[PDB]
Amino acid sequence: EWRNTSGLYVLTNDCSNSSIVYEADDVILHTPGCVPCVQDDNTSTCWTPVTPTVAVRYVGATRPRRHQTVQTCNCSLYPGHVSG
């Protein structure tokens, strides 16, 4: 729910190392309260959440892999709200 930067706790939607229960090479499972963000090489992005417990990279949900669990990632806290 929060991350550490320059000696200052700051709110975020990135998952901590302890907030993820299981992760696969195309699916992450996590406790509700955050959203997965992953960096592979000079490229970090968000993961699409559906039924917030489980998140997908692209919408293709239907062999664990440790995908770097990184938190230098902004999205989902500014919705970019489409007109409801």
Partner: protein, 322 residues
């Protein structure tokens, strides 16, 4: 451009009220005193009733002399200036002299002990977060037995945390007009050039779980905002230019509703770091819009999903239906 939507301002909450035409004659102003800036207690009528004080405060919007306010506020520090926090919370023990000026948002108070009324002017307000006035009782009958000399009708607070006790903290001014406050012990965030913040309020940014309920003690909810009350103008002079918001607290199982002021101006940089946790609850419970304190957020996730959704330019709004 950073601004708000629901921000109500009482700066010009008047019109054609020239019947008094000069502060109802109890003019308030700040005066230096040997390098200390307090309210001029001399004229400063003292034995008024609640209605008379309310009438007095209604007219007090324009004649406030903004001269000593900045140099007086120079003592106060922003939340950034302190150091980081970690570990489990521990209740601090405030003892000895307290050189720090009490009007700062980050002032750690002493426990709210007994206090004779011979050295207080105006009503004393405790904050179960909504404000309440505190009455008295004569000192002769009870065996508390004359703290001073032939003094009468003393004040006693003796409250624990509002979930168990009665109020977080209380505030007033003493006879010479200097602000005096007390409250529950604050949290120590280090035991378990900068200075060690003792967290008298919701210090979310400097400590993650140092919430208002556990740590807050006093009228300050956030380092930016506070709970308003009719004598807020009386007690704290420099908060004249604040803007008001409606707040729902829901503390200790019971429901609390009141108004809050904030040191907010249009155009303040509020990108992501200048957000403070504050446990709000919906007033209308519909329209998916939450009127939240500016530069803040609430730990109430969205309807279908979670993840706090906040707008780029308007900070008072909390979004639902993510």
């Amino acid at each position: 451009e950073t601004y708000v939507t629901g921000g109500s301002v009482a700066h010009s909450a008047r019109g054609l009220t020239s019947l008094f035409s000069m502060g109802a004659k109890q003019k308030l102003q700040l005066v230096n005193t040997n390098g200390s800036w307090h309210i001029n207690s001399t004229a400063l009528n003292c034995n008024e009733s609640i209605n008379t004080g309310f009438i007095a405060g209604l007219f007090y919007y324009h004649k406030f002399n903004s001269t000593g306010c900045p140099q007086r506020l120079s003592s106060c520090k922003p939340i950034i200036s302190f150091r980081q926090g970690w570990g489990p919370l521990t209740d601090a023990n405030i003892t000895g002299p307290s050189d720090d000026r009490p009007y700062c948002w980050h002032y750690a108070p002493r426990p709210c002990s007994v206090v004779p009324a011979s050295s207080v002017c105006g009503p004393v307000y405790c904050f179960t977060p909504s404000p309440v006035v505190v009455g008295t009782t004569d000192i002769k009958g009870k065996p508390t037995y004359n703290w001073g000399e032939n003094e009468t009708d003393v004040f006693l607070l003796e409250s624990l945390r509002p979930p168990s006790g009665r109020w977080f903290g209380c505030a007033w001014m003493n006879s010479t007009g200097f602000l005096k406050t007390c409250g529950a012990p604050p949290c120590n965030i280090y035991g378990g050039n900068e200075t060690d913040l003792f967290c008298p309020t919701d210090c979310f940014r400097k400590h993650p779980e140092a919430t208002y309920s556990r740590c807050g003690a006093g009228p300050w909810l956030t380092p930016r905002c506070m709970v308003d009350y009719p004598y807020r103008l009386w007690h704290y002079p420099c908060t004249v230019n604040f803007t008001l918001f409606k707040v729902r607290m829901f503390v200790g199982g019971f429901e609390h509703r009141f108004t809050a002021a904030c040191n907010w101006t249009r155009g303040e940089r509020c990108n992501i770091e200048d957000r403070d946790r504050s446990e709000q609850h919906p007033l209308l419970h519909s329209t998916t819009e939450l009127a939240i304190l500016p530069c803040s957020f609430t730990p109430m996730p969205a309807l279908s999903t979670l993840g706090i959704h906040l707008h780029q330019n308007i900070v008072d709004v909390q979004y639902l239906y993510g």
